[PDB]
User: Which sequence fits this backbone?
């Protein structure tokens, strides 16, 4: 009877969030990125996915 | 549980 | 993404800078069959664009805030273990020793 | 109680075993 | 006999419309709180 | 001689599934999105292309 | 360690199995903290 | 009479200290993050720190 | 006080207990060893041409 | 004595850290770099370095 009291929401949030780089480089043998991933006040990220 | 899915 | 601290972490929200150094060295990003000892044959890579992804579970904003304001503590805190959990020492053995 | 979170098999909520809270996976443990 | 080529006017679209993805739900943008991240705009396939 | 690539997936012997839950999980036979206060109240015709 | 005689120059992979605990928390809103060690071979 | 400071030399060349508006804001309360009187003992035990109550290994947090 | 072989060095490590490289803690530009002289460029380390 | 008690750090600060351009842009006579240098809550930059 899988329950409905405060599991999944109405408040219109996304499910996958692709992030896009800064720190785009090139090297003869290396490459770098960095991502200011923002998540925000709620919607806790599980970090394995 | 005999069911096509959860 | 295999680093043991950030492998199965639970990430309470904020804004988090997340850097990565990839490797463009064609020798140990590829793999031969016959021991084709590369970087002299002509193999190379080129990276167009590298993007992140994530997957938020949608929790209710009253029950995420009873996770988040309960996980933010001094005793409710994550702790991971390396599996192999060791330290290689890497001793050389010269020719026929 | 937190009974409004578990996927209930009927009226009784599905509350798991006590080994489903930690882990002890080391090399040879 | 040389008749002229016929003219057209390559110009920007009026009011610059079509240059920002509208109603493409998925290619939308968002004004959102820096700390809160929540969508203060959601879009529909309809509603031109 | 130069080349492009071609990609294709094979899904035999099983059907695609789309669960009727707002988080799409198989939490139970009933769902949270199936017995809420919007779909058990009113009738709803569906268009499905 | 005693090995069989070999042709090419080799090495040996000593793997001292130790502990590793990477206890972390985030006590602010957007500030993460990491406290860790391995504790026969620790960085200290 | 209501506004000006009663002085002898109108247009003086060097004003005194007390007759000039100063700026005295509040004393700046600085929140020290991690009191190192018991934090340097934690690293010497062997645990390297990273990241950054305020910390879990020490319970106290002084601020000046 | 004659010394003239300071330019023939490659890479210098300092390991306490054969465990921890000495400055540790991710101090400097490559913290496992003290790279006195890198022949190839890298992401750009070379001082004074 | 060269004193202790809050002179040198403990908590894994990198000493020198190479920043990066994001969106370099080109004209035939000029070259316009575009940096995002940032330091957080600590490590107060001298900017003569």
Assistant:
């Amino acid at each position: 009877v899988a329950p409905t009291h405060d599991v999944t929401t109405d408040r219109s949030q996304r499910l996958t969030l692709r992030f896009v780089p800064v720190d785009r480089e090139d090297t003869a043998y290396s490459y770098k990125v960095r991502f200011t991933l923002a998540v925000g006040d709620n919607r806790v990220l599980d970090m394995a996915s | 549980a005999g069911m096509y899915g959860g | 993404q295999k680093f043991f601290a950030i492998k199965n972490l639970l990430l309470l929200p904020g804004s988090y800078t997340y850097e990565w150094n990839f490797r463009k060295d064609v020798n140990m990003i590829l793999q031969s069959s016959l021991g084709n000892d590369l970087r002299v044959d002509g193999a190379s890579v080129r990276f167009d664009s590298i993007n992140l992804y994530a997957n938020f579970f949608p929790m209710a904003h009253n029950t995420a805030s009873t996770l988040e304001a309960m996980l933010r503590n001094d005793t409710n805190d994550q702790s991971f273990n390396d599996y192999l959990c060791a330290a290689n020492m890497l001793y050389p053995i010269p020719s026929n020793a | 109680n937190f009974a409004s979170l578990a996927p209930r098999h009927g009226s009784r909520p599905f509350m798991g075993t006590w080994n489903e809270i930690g882990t002890s996976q080391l090399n040879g443990g | 006999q040389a008749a002229p080529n016929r003219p057209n006017y390559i110009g920007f679209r009026d009011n610059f419309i079509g240059l920002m993805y509208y109603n493409s739900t998925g290619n939308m943008g968002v004004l959102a709180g820096q700390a809160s991240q929540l969508n203060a705009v959601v879009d529909l396939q309809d509603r031109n | 001689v130069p080349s492009l690539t071609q990609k294709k997936f094979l899904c035999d012997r099983t059907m695609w599934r789309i669960p009727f839950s707002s988080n799409f999980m198989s939490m139970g036979a009933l769902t949270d999105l199936g017995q809420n206060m919007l779909y058990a109240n009113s009738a709803h015709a569906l268009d499905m292309t | 360690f005693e090995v069989d005689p070999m042709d090419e120059p080799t090495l040996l992979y000593v793997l001292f199995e130790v502990f590793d605990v990477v206890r972390i928390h985030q006590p602010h809103r957007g500030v993460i903290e990491a406290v860790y060690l391995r504790t026969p071979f620790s960085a200290g | 009479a209501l506004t000006s400071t009663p002085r002898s030399q109108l247009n003086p060349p060097n004003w005194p200290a007390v007759q000039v508006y100063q700026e005295n804001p509040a004393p700046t309360t600085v929140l020290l993050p991690r009191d190192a009187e018991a934090e340097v003992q934690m690293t010497n035990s062997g645990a390297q720190l990273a990241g950054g109550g305020r910390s879990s290994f020490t319970p106290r947090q002084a601020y000046l | 006080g004659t010394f003239y072989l300071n330019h023939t060095f490659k890479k210098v490590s300092i390991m306490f207990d054969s465990s921890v490289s000495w400055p540790g803690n991710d101090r400097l530009l490559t913290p496992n060893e003290f790279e006195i002289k890198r022949t190839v460029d890298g992401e750009g380390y070379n001082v004074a041409q």
Observations:
- Chain D touches chain G at residues 27-28 (CB under 8 Å).
- The radius of gyration of chain D is 14 Å.
- DSSP finds no helices and no strands in chain D.
- Residues 6 and 18 of chain D are 15 Å apart (CA to CA).
